[PDB]
Amino acid sequence: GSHSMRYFYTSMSRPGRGEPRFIAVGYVDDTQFVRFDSDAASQRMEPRAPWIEQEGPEYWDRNTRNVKAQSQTDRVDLGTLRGYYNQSEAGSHTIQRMYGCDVGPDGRFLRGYHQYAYDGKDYIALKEDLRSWTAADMAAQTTKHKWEAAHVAEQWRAYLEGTCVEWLRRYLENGKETLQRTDAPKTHMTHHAVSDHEATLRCWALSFYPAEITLTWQRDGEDQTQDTELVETRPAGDGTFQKWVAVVVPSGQEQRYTCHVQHEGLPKPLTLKW
């Protein structure tokens, strides 16, 4: 019922391989709509979903300006943080930056997000209130000082609780016939002998959306994790998602096991048995 908009930035230094690469993606929920790459030919903020193409060239200008600028400042933060932790000119390092907002079915603002990582670790982040910065390490407090007195958190709260939610609602209302759809998972089972006395019962949930889903095995009515394998949710490459869960069971006892599927696009949770 709820919805979310999230932007992800990544910048990687490649000393000797060239000048730092910058990649930026924007998702509404589990649906990407925009992308940008520094190694890209067009070097333009491109569309990735049909329902966002309906924006005047000023959109595609403003966003492009912003992403280019952010790429440059990221280029700065690279050498900056390379100075902080005293890192060689040689080493390759990564800056990741995630931010965005959440809304209910009501469209009401629910929560804001801004986190910043260096080399894959939390470097700094913004709390719920969108007022106070939290720094993970020593050198991060320096940055926090630079942003505490620059009223940066104010700019962030002004953007997130305002413009972000606005454009989120707009995107939702626009793409409604794709963004507010709920593809129910087509489910089925497979069954393969493993030993002379055992078999695998694999429970399949395909072609669903959104990715959020729950698959569980039950022995005679009580859950099992013993002898079970659960794979991470994966994209089909069409906008839908796939997932499965398998359990190794004794031969002839497949009737005792029950697979359970839960997903928003389902009125009532399914129960599959072999």
Binding site: A69, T73, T163
Partner: peptide
């Protein structure tokens, strides 16, 4: 859209 916030660390 995106943000205009640009500030070094």
């Amino acid at each position: 859209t995106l943000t205009s916030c640009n500030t070094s660390v």
